[PDB]
Amino acid sequence: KKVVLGKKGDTVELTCTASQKKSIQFHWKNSNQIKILGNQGSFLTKGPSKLNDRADSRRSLWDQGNFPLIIKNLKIEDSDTYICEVEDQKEEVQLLVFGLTANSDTHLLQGQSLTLTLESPPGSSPSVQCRSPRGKNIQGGKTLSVSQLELQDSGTWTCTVLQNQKKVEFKIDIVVL
Amino acid sequence: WKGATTTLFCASDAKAYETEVHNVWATHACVPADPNPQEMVLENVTENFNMWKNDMVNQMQEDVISLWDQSLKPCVKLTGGSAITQACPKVTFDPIPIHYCTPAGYAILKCNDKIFNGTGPCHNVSTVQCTHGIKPVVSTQLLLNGSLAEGEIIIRSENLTNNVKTIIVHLNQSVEIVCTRPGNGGDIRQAHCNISEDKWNETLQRVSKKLAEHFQNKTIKFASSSGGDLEVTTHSFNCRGEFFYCNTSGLFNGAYTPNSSSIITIPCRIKQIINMWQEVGRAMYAPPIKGNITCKSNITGLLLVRDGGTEPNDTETFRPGGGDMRNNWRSELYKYKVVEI
């Protein structure tokens, strides 16, 4: 089916279309059947879901039968299967949110060990790899690290998270100098 | 006869040299209300009704939209993205009852069962030329100034198992609410509503019981609106031309079981900038007039939505809903159906 990937703190826009029509009723549910967001005539309503104050929709598109679920400042836990119910239809999209963090301080040096953590949902088993400034990559599970750091181990580390093929990228700066 | 659609006309007791806006709309758009409404019981007949598919609701919506569009002129209006401005004089605004009438070749069938819920067969059916008079009050959360159920409180929904479906609660005793923006009146846009604590408590207690009947083995509780636009999160309504937003937190708070002051007080704001109900867009009016801006209303209905959810947790919780004004008209049109003779 359809899977959408998103990075922590980013904003995502899940799509939904009514059989090429007009402005009509729609609702977005999670897999737990909790109501997220929908319309009441011309107004937007929002249900008792965890995502409450960050869900939004693009009202101007409603005439054209587009009813997106917009989720701002994505949290890991937003990862779920979302259902948009329109007229007779049920459309499903699975959201996976990941974050990639450097669980060390900001300023490291010398022979310290740098250790990167993937924050992932429990539906996830993504593959993770991080490219050093020197082009050295390091494949890894959920917490990949470097044995002993170095001076040129500073700069812009580029990390790719693969899942459903399909990918997201985390540029992380590390400073050892 | 045979179910049908056709082009209704309206009827009212509008005065024609009155400047109030509903009066001005009706006097050109409607017929004078017949002094002698003919109603004829049909012995030996049963009819199916479905309030949820009643095109009479469509036409009423269409009228109320036209009325608003012609009567309440915002200084700024946003529609296609296309902003426009125009004169926005203050206006005189107080809904009058409007009747819906069928022309020759057609008749309106009216269900008189006191138990009627809006769908399924009706056993005491009469025929009329017009509906009773129906005030087009535009509101969310609380249905104001409607008629009262005659027997017991009634629960209406197109589908109670579906938690997206708005539940219309038809009261059978009203609870007065007085909302006012005081003259002096430090914050000009500050306001509050008073509701008899005992009367509200009694009302929610009984609604819970009804609700318990459709959701057996459930604790029934009520909670604040769950968010969305301010027009829907608060109890909003227009009062003397101003758009009130009244916080109902202190009205939907916990469980209500058979056994501050005597008065619940609810804070309200008057807003100039509003989301439009007629269509997707925003309007901007002038600041509130002077003096006491007060509306005293009868809460005669409720608009609720049930949380639902595949929780093993088994207490049903209900929040104030609304926003689709077709439900407002459905709460009054539910016992009428147009029929071609």
Numbering used by the authors:
A (entry chain C): 1 to 177
B (entry chain A): 45 to 124, 198 to 301, 323 to 397, 409 to 490
From the paper:
Initially synthesized as a heavily glycosylated gp160 precursor, the human immunodeficiency virus type I (HIV-1) envelope glycoprotein (Env) is cleaved enzymatically by cellular proteases before binding to the cell surface as two non-covalently associated subunits: gp120 and gp41. Gp120 is the receptor binding subunit2 that interacts subsequently with the primary receptor CD4 and a co-receptor (either CCR5 or CXCR4) and undergoes a series of entry-related conformational changes. In addition to its critical role in the life cycle of HIV-1, Env is also the sole target on the surface of HIV-1 virions for antibody-mediated neutralization.
To define precisely the conformational change of HIV-1 CRF07_BC gp120 induced only by the engagement of soluble CD4, ruling out an influence of co-receptor mimics, we solved the crystal structure of the HIV-1 gp120 core with an extended stem of variable loop 3 (V3)1920, which is designated as coreV3e, in complex with the N-terminal two domains (D1D2) of CD4921 (hereafter referred to as CD4D1D2). The complex structure was solved at 2.47 Å. CD4 D1 is bound into a pocket formed at the nexus of three gp120 domains, in which Phe43 plays a critical role in the interaction between gp120 and CD49. A second binding interface between HIV-1 gp120 and CD4, comprising residues T90, N234-linked N-acetylglucosamine (NAG), H240, and E269 from gp120; and residues T81, E92, P122, and S125 from CD4, was identified. Specifically, within the interface, the side chain of gp120 T90 forms double hydrogen bonds with the carboxylate group of CD4 E92. Additionally, the side chain of H240 makes a hydrogen bond with the hydroxyl group of T81, and the Oε2 atom of E269 forms a hydrogen bond with the side chain of S125. Furthermore, the N234-linked NAG packs closely with P122. This second interface buries a surface area of 471 Å2, which is much smaller than the 940 Å2 in the primary gp120-CD4 interface. Residual mutagenesis on this interface was harmful to Env-mediated cell-cell fusion and pseudotyped HIV-1 infection, indicating that this interface is important for HIV-1 fusion and entry. Superimposition of the CD4 molecules from the two complexes revealed that the ibalizumab epitope is positioned on the same region of CD4 as that of the non-canonical binding interface engaged with HIV-1 gp120.
